[PDB]
Ligand binder design. Structure first.
Ligand code: HEM
Length: 366
C-alpha cells in the first residue's frame, strides 16, 4: 500500500475515482477529520431518528448502530461526557499494577521454546482489562471473542443492513444480565435519558471496540522492534513510550476512516459534492514526507510524533490513554523477561485496511 500512498501523496493528495473520495496527505486528512461541520460522522442514521429513539418508538434495531462513534455534535458531546473522564490519564493510572500483575501472569504461560504470543499475550490482555474496568465478567472468552468479530468497529462505510440475528441476541442478552454488577461507567449510562438501545450501543462499544485494535498494536510493536532489532536499545536507552508511538505511526492498527460531507466543500483543490463519502487514509498521512522527516524509516526516538493513528478532533480515540498504557506495560515486561527473541512464524490478518496478526509464534529462550 505504501508505494501507492507515496505516489498519490506527490501526484494526487485528494483523488476521486468513480464512487468514493480518497485523501492521502497529512494536511487534508487532518483538515477532514477536524472539520466536523463539513465532514460528518452521521453514517448510521443516529440523527435522523434520535427523537423516535428517545420517544421509545424503536426497539428491534442493531444497538451498535447508535453510539458516539457515529455521531455529530451536540449529540456527540452529550454521549462522550458520560465517560470522558473515566479513561483520562491518572484516573487510569490507578490500574498500572493490575495491568502489570496480569501481564506477568500471562507471560508465565508462555513456552520459551515456542509459543504464539497473539494467543498467549496480545488477545487476552485487552479483554481481561476492559472487563475489569466495566465490571462485566467474561466467562465466554471464546463465545465472547465471537461477538467482537461480529460487532466489528473497523471504521469503514456502515453496514447497509442493520437487521438482528441470533448471535447478536446472545450478546444483547449477556449485556442485560450483567448490566447490573457494572462499574461507575456503566451506571452513568444505565441512568440517563438515553433510550435503552442507545445504552446497549454504548456498553457494547466500550466493551468491544478497542480489543482487536489494542491486540494488533501489541503485535505490530513486537514484530517491528524485532524486525529492526531495537529491543536492546529500547531496553537500555529506556524509550518505551516514544517507541510505541513510532509503532502506532509506522504500523497503524486501522489504516483509514470514513466521513460523509453534509455540505458542498472545496478540499485544497478539488471540490467534493454534498452527500459523497470520503475515505481518509491515516496510514498514508503518517508517512507524509512533509511532516515526518524520514517518514519511511522506523525511528524509535522521533519525539515530536504527531501521528493520526488515534484520530484527530472531537472523535479522537476515547481509549487512547488506555491503549498506550497497556501496550507500554506489555512491552516493558515482555522485554524484561526474554532478552532474546526470534520470530519463527507469523500470519497476518486478512483484511487489508488493518495491521495485525492472526498468530505470531516466537522462540524466546529464557
Ligand atoms: C491501539 C488501539 C487503538 C487504536 C489504534 C484506536 C483507534 C481509533 C481511531 C483512529 C478512532 C477515530 C475514529 C474517527 O475519528 O472516525 C477511535 C475512536 C474510538 N475508540 Fe479507539 N483505538 C484504539 C483503542 C481503543 C480502546 C482500548 C478503546 C477503549 C474502549 C477504544 C474506544 C474508542 C471509542 C469509544 C471511540 C469513539 C470516540 C468518539 O467518537 O468520540 N479505542 N479509535
Amino acid at each position: 500500500m505504501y508505494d501507492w500512498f507515496s505516489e498519490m501523496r506527490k501526484k494526487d493528495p485528494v483523488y476521486y475515482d468513480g464512487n468514493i473520495w480518497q485523501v492521502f496527505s497529512y494536511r487534508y486528512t487532518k483538515e477532514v477529520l477536524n472539520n466536523f461541520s463539513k465532514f460528518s460522522s452521521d453514517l448510521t442514521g443516529y440523527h435522523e431518528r434520535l427523537e423516535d429513539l428517545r420517544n421509545g418508538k424503536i426497539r428491534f434495531d442493531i444497538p451498535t448502530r447508535y453510539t458516539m462513534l457515529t455521531s455529530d455534535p451536540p449529540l456527540h458531546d452529550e454521549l462522550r461526557s458520560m465517560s470522558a473522564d473515566i479513561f483520562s490519564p491518572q484516573k487510569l493510572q490507578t490500574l498500572e499494577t493490575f495491568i502489570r500483575e496480569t501481564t506477568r501472569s500471562l507471560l508465565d504461560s508462555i513456552d520459551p521454546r515456542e509459543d504464539d504470543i497473539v494467543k498467549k499475550l496480545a488477545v487476552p490482555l485487552p479483554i481481561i482489562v476492559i472487563s475489569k474496568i466495566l465490571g462485566l465478567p467474561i466467562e465466554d472468552k471464546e463465545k465472547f471473542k465471537e461477538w467482537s468479530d461480529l460487532v466489528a468497529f473497523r471504521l469503514g462505510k456502515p453496514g447497509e443492513i442493520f437487521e438482528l440475528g441470533k448471535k447478536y441476541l446472545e450478546l444483547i442478552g449477556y449485556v442485560k444480565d450483567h448490566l447490573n454488577s457494572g462499574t461507575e461507567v456503566v451506571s452513568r449510562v444505565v441512568n440517563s435519558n438515553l433510550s435503552d438501545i442507545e445504552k446497549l450501543g454504548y456498553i457494547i462499544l466500550l466493551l468491544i471496540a478497542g480489543n482487536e485494535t489494542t491486540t494488533n498494536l501489541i503485535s505490530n510493536s513486537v514484530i517491528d522492534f524485532t524486525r529492526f532489532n531495537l529491543w536492546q536499545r529500547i531496553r537500555e536507552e529506556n524509550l518505551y513510550l516514544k517507541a510505541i508511538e513510532e509503532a502506532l505511526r509506522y504500523s497503524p492498527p486501522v489504516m483509514r476512516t470514513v466521513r460523509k460531507t453534509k455540505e458542498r466543500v472545496k478540499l485544497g483543490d478539488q471540490t467534493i459534492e454534498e452527500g459523497e463519502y470520503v475515505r481518509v487514509w491515516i496510514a498514508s498521512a503518517n508517512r507524509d514526507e512533509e511532516v515526518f522527516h524520514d517518514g519511511e524509516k522506523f525511528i524509535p526516538d522521533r519525539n515530536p510524533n504527531p501521528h493520526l493513528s488515534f484520530g484527530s478532533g472531537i472523535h479522537l480515540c476515547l481509549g487512547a490513554p488506555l491503549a498506550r498504557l497497556e501496550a507500554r506495560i506489555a512491552i516493558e515486561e515482555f522485554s524484561k523477561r526474554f532478552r532474546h527473541i526470534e520470530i519463527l512464524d507469523t500470519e497476518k490478518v486478512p483484511n487489508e485496511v488493518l495491521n495485525g496478526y492472526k498468530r505470531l509464534v516466537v522462540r524466546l529462550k529464557s
